[PDB]
Amino acid sequence: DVNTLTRFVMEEGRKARGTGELTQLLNSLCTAVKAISSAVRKAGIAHLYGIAGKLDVLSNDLVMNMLKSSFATCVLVSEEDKHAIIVEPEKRGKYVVCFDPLDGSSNIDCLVSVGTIFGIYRKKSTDEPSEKDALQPGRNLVAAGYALYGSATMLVLAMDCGVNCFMLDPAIGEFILVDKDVKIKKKGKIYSLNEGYAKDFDPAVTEYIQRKKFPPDNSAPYGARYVGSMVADVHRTLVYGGIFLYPANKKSPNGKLRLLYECNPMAYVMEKAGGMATTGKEAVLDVIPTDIHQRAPVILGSPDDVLEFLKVYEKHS
Amino acid sequence: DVNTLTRFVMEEGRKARGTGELTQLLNSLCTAVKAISSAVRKAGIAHLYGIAGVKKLDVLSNDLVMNMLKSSFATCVLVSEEDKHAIIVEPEKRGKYVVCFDPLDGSSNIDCLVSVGTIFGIYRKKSTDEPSEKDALQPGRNLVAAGYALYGSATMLVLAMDCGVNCFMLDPAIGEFILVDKDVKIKKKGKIYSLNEGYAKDFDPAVTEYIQRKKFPPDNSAPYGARYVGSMVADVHRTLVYGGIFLYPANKKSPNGKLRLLYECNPMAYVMEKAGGMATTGKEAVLDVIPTDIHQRAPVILGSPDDVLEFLKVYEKHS
Amino acid sequence: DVNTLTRFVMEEGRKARGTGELTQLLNSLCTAVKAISSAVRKAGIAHLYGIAGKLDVLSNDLVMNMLKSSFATCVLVSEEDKHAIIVEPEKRGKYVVCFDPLDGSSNIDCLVSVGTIFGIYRKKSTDEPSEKDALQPGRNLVAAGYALYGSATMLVLAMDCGVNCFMLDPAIGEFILVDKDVKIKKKGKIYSLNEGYAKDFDPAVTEYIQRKKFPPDNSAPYGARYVGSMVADVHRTLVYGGIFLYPANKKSPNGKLRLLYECNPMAYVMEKAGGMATTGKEAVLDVIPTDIHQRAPVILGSPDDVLEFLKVYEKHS
Amino acid sequence: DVNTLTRFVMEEGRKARGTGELTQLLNSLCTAVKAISSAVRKAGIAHLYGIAGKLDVLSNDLVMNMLKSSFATCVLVSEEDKHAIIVEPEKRGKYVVCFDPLDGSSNIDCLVSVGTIFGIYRKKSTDEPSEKDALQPGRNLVAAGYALYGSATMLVLAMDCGVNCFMLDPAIGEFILVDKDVKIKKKGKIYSLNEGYAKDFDPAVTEYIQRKKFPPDNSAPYGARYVGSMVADVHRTLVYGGIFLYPANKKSPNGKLRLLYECNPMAYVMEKAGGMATTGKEAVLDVIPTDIHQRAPVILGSPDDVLEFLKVYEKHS
C-alpha cells in the first residue's frame, strides 16, 4: 500500500515499542520542513512585492519553534545560532537535535537547490542539559537525514531500519514514501567537489581526481557535477552513485562543512545506504566533536569510489 | 507598484502598439510553464503511489507547451527538442510567430531532483510562404523574445526582449509571475567558471588552458570557484545572477559542441546579450550563426563580457 | 481547445479591436481574486497561530491595489469604503468598478462560501472622475460577474458575448474555461430567501412563496435553499435554475442588498444568461442610482419563475 | 504554542497511554481528507480540459484505502457501499469506522460546501469481524467529527476530551488547531431545515417553525439558513448556535439522514460541545441500529432550542 512519512514512522515506532517521543519529534520536524518548502518556493511573495498595497532566519525559527513545542527535545544546535539552545524545563524531552535549517542558502539568490539537514541524538549524559550534549560522535545518531528543496521537495530519513525517501506532494502537503530501504550503487560515474580549490588540494585528492579525468585503465572518465549546495550534491550521490568531496583546502584547514549538522547526518545517511564517509583519516561518524560548529573534511559516496580514494590517500601515507 | 508577467507584457505591447499576438503567445507560454512547474514539484504524485487504491515529465512538458502554443493562435511553426521535424500549426490556428523550445532542459537528471528548466526562443516568421521548417532557420539576432523558466528552489521566468531582461518569480499561492528583478544586467567580470571538467581528457587545449588560469592565476588573484549543475538553465541562471562564465565548447570528438542552437544556445545567448553579456562559439557570436538544420549543435561560451573576452584570447592563441 | 480567462478575454478584445484597457482591468482583478481565494482557503494560517514562533479588509486592499495599478480605472466603489475611491491621476484609466470584495463575510466564521462581486462601466464625464461616474443604471454595464469561493473557486464573467464560467485550478493558479455561453434553465425547482423575515414580507412575496410550497396545480413543491451568502445563492440559481429573493423588510425597507455592487452585477449576469432580475417595480438594471451604497430589493432567476412572481406582485397591485 | 491535529492527537494519545492505533487511524483519515480537499478544490482540473492535449467515488476510494492501509480498522461502513467492508486479516486493527466520504455531493455542481463525516467505534465482540460490529449505538463512539470543505477546509474532531477545530493550511498541508474545546451557545437565533417541503411537515415541526417566524410574544423572529449540505448546516449550528432539523414525517417515518455515518457523528460532536441531538423520541446516540444504512430523524443544536422543539413535539404526541 501507499505510505506516508508520519505513518511510516508510527508503524516503525509501534514495532519498536518506544514511548512516542521520536515520532513526535519527527512529525514536528516534518511540519517545519513543509513550511520551509512553501517559503522557499516563494508562496506569498506577491504580498511582499505590493499586491495588497530572512529565509534562513524564518527556516531556523520554524525548526526551533516546531522542535521546542514537540516536547521531545532538550538541546538544539543550529547553523544559525552561535550557542546551543537549551529548551525550557517545561518543554524538555529526551532528544538532542543538530540542524542546518537552510543549507546552501547563502546562494539562494540564483535559486540553487537548498535543504534542511538534521541529526537526532538521545541525550546521553544525565547532567542538566547543555551544549555538551550535542558533542557526540555521529555513531551515536538515532535518526538523521535531510529535506531537499530541489526541482521537487524530498525528505530522506535514515534510521536503524535503513534509508527511506519521501516525496512531498504539495497538493495535499504529505510526504509520500517513494523509495524503500535505499542502497547506494557500489561504484558510480560522477565526482563532486569545488575544483576551484585545485591549487590547495592534497596530493591524495589531486591524484584521485586525476584518475577520474584520466583513468589508468582507459575506462570512461567520471562526469563532473558540483551544484555548490551540499544536500543537492549529496542527494545526487545517493541517487546516482559516485563520490562527493569537500576536503580541507590546505588554506582552510579543518574542512569547510560543519561536523554536527552537515557531515554527520550525511555520513549516517551514507552508511545506512551502504555507503562510506571519511575525513580521509577516520570515519566521519567516529570523530568525537569538541565544538558544536567545528568543521571536518568530508569524502563520501559509493563504497568502491570512497575506498579507491582511501587507497590513494594511503599511498600518499 | 506590483507587476506581473502578463500585465508587464500587455503594457510593453500597448506602448509598442502591436496587435497582441505576442502577448497572447507569451500568456499561453507562462500558463504551460506554471503547469510544468506544478508537474515538476510532483503535485498529485500521491495518486501515482496508490493513495486512492503515465506520461514522463519531458513528454508532458512538450505536450503542455505545444498545446498552449498551438491554441494561442499566435504561432505557425514550432520546433521542440522532443520532435524530429518542425510542427506546422494547422491553418485555422496559425499566427505570426515561430517558437523554438526545449520543454524540459536537464530532464535526463530529474531523478536526483536537480534544477530543471524550459528554454524558449520566439521569432517572427519572415516570409509569406506556406509555413515550414525553414521559417525556424533564422540567426539568433532575429529573436523577438527569449528566455527560460527555471524550476529550482523557486520557479522563475526570465524574459528577454528589446526593453531588456526581466525576472519574474512564480508565486505558487496565486499562480502569478511577479516582477522581482527589472532590467537585469550581468557583472562585467565574475569569479565562477562552469563546465563539465570530467571530460577534461577530450578538452580543446585552449579550454584546458583557460580553465587552468581560472584555477591557477598567474597574478596573485583569487582562483575562481567552480560550479556545474549539469542543467543549462540552472548554470546559465547562476551565471546571469552572480557573473562569470559557462562553457560547453567544441572539441575533436565534437567539432560543433553538444548543445542545440535553435532552442538552447540562441535563447541563452539572447538573454546574455540583452543583459550586457556575451555568447560565442569560439569563432563567432552565437546570435550570428545561420542555422541549416533545426537540430544543429553549436559550441557555447557565455557569461560576463570580460570573462568571455578572456576565453576568446586563449581560444585564438590556439587558432 | 482549452482556454483560460485571460486569453479568452484577449481574443474577445482582439475581435472587438479595443485598446486592451478592459483586458488589462480584467487580468488585474483576476490576480486579486486568486490572491483573495488563497487567503479565504487559509493558506499561511499556520503563521498566525505561531508555527514560526481581517479577511474582508485584505480582500478590499487586494482589489483596490490591483485595479489602481491596472491603469484601467479611475473610480472605485467598494462595500468597504464610505466613498468612491478616485484613482490618482498617474494611474487613471477609463473604467468605473463597483465591487464587493468579500461578499458574505460577516458569516465567514462558519466557513460559509464567500465571494467577490464586481460591475464595470465606462466613465461618464470628461470632467474629474467623481463618485457620480459610479451612479449609472446597471444597463450601462460593460462587464459584470463574481468569483465564488465555495467548495472550489469559480469566476463567472458576463459581457456582451454572454456568460462564461472559469474554474480556478489551484495547482497552477489559472482560471480554466469550463462553461461556455451559459444559459439559465427556463424554470427551476428551487426558491431562495430568508424566511426568517416572513413576518415582514409584503403580501406578494407571501403568496409567491406559499405557491412554491403548496402548488395550486398540485405539482411538486419547490425545494428551499438559502446559504445566506448572495454569491453562493445566485450561483446555484444560475446553475440549477429557480429563484433568489431579497425583498424588503422593516429593518431593510428598501431591501438589504446594495444596488451598485450586489444587485446590478448579478442582474447583468442573469440577463446575459437569459434569466431575469426585478425589484418588483422595475428591472434592476433600469434603476437609476442616486447613492453609491443605495439599497435595492431583488428578485432574480429563471425567466418563468421571475415572471410568475411579477404576475403575483401584479395581482397584489 | 502552535498545535497540529496529528501532534494534538499523539499528545492526547500518550496521556491516555494507548497502543497508538487510534492515532494511526486518525492520521490516515486526516491524509485522505487532505486529498479529498485537494480534489474538491479542483486541483488539476486544467488537465481534464486538455491543457496538455467522480468526486464521491474518489473520496470513497481515498477514505477506504487510507483506512485499510492504516492497520487500525476491521470494519468499514460507507454511505457508498451497501455492505460493510471487512478489512483483510493482515491489515486488521480494532476499530470500526462509519463514514460518508462526500456529504452533499449531489449539490457539488453548484460549488456549495461539501464535507466528510466519520464515526469511530471499538469492535466489542470477539467474533470474526462482520457488519454486526458497526451496529452499535452512538453512545459507544470513541471519536467522531467531520471535515467541511467550505470557504476553507476545517476538520472538527470530537473525543472524550471534547471538541476541537482544526483549519487546513493548504500552503503546508497541516491541520492547525484554531478552536479548543468548543462549546455551543445555549440558545441561537437561526433555524435550519428545508421549508419547501412544508406541505409534508409533522404538525409539531409546522408549529415549531411558525413559532420561530411569528413568535407568539412580541419578539424578534429567527433567521433562516439552509445550505442543503448537512456538514455546512451543522457546522454553522456549532459555530453560531440555533437549530438544525431533518425531522420525521408520515412519508418519512424515520427521516432521511443516515444514523451511522451522519446523525451519530453529528450527535456526538453536538453533545461533546454541550448541545443536544434528538429524533424527537430519543437521543440520537441512544438508538440501537439494526441496519448499517438505517435512517434517523435528527433535530440538533443549541439545547434551549432543541428543548423548545421537544416541548412542541410533546404537545403534538
Ligand SMILES: Cc1ccc(S(=O)(=O)NC(=O)/N=c2/[nH]cc(Br)s2)cc1
Ligand atoms: C524507529 C522508531 C520510531 C519511533 C520510536 S518511538 O518514538 O520511541 N516510539 C513510538 O513512536 N511509539 C509509538 N507508539 C504509538 C505510536 Br502512534 S508511536 C522508536 C523507534
Ligand SMILES: Cc1ccc(S(=O)(=O)NC(=O)/N=c2/[nH]cc(Br)s2)cc1
Ligand atoms: C514588447 C511587446 C509585447 C507584445 C507586443 S504585441 O503582442 O504585438 N502587441 C500587443 O500585445 N498589444 C496589445 N494591445 C492590447 C493589449 Br492588452 S496588448 C508588442 C510588443
Ligand SMILES: Cc1ccc(S(=O)(=O)NC(=O)/N=c2/[nH]cc(Br)s2)cc1
Ligand atoms: C470583450 C472585450 C474585452 C476587451 C476589450 S479591450 O480591452 O477594449 N480591447 C482588447 O482587449 N484588445 C486586445 N486585443 C488583443 C489583446 Br492581447 S488585447 C474589448 C472587448
Ligand SMILES: Cc1ccc(S(=O)(=O)NC(=O)/N=c2/[nH]cc(Br)s2)cc1
Ligand atoms: C485521545 C486518544 C488518542 C489516541 C489514543 S491511542 O491511539 O490509543 N494511543 C496513542 O496514540 N498512543 C501513543 N503513544 C505514543 C504516540 Br506518538 S501515540 C488514545 C487516546
